[PDB]
Amino acid sequence: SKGNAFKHKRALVEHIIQAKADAQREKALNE
Amino acid sequence: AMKKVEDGNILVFQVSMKANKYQIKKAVKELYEVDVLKVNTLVRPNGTKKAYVRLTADYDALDIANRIGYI
Amino acid sequence: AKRTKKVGITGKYGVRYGSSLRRQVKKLEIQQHARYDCSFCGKKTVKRGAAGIWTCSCCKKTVAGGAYTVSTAAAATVRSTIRRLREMVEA
Amino acid sequence: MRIKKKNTRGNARNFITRSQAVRKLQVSLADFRRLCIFKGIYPREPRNKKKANKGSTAPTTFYYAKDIQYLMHEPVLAKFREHKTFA
Amino acid sequence: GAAKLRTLDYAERHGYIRGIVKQIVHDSGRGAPLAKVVFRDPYKYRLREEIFIANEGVHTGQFIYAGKKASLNVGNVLPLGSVPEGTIVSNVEEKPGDRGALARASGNYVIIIGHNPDENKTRVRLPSGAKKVISSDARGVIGVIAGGGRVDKPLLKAGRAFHKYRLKRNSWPKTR
Amino acid sequence: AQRVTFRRRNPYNTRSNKIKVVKTPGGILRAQHVKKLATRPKCGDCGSALQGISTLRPRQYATVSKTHKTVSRAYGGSRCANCVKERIIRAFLIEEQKIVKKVVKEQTEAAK
Amino acid sequence: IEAASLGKESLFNLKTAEKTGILNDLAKGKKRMIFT
Amino acid sequence: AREITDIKQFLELTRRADVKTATVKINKKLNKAGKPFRQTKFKVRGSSSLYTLVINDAGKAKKLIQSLPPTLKVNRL
RNA sequence: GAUGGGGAAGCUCCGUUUCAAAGGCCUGAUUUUAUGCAGGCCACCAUCGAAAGGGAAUCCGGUUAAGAUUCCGGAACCUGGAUAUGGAUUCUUCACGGUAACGUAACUGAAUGUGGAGACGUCGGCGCGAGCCCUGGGAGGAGUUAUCUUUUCUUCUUAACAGCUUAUCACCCCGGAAUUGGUUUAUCCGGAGAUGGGGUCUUAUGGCUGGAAGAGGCCAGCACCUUUGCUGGCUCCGGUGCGCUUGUGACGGCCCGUGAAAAUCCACAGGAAGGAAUAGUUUUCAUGCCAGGUCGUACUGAUAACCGCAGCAGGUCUCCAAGGUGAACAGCCUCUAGUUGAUAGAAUAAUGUAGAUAAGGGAAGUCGGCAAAAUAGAUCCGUAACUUCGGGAUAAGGAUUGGCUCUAAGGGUCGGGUAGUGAGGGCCUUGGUCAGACGUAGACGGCCUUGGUGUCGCUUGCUACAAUUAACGAUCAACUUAGAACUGGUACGGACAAGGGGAAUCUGACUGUCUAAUUAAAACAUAGCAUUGCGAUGGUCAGAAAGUGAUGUUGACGCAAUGUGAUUUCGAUUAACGAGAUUCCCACUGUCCCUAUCUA
RNA sequence: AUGGUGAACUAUGCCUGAAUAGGGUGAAGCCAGAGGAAACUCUGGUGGAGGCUCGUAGCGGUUCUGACGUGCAAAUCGAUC
Ligand SMILES: [Zn+2]
Ligand SMILES: [Zn+2]
Question: Which NCBIfam families match (chain C)?
Answer without folding.
Answer: eL43_euk_arch, PRK03976.1
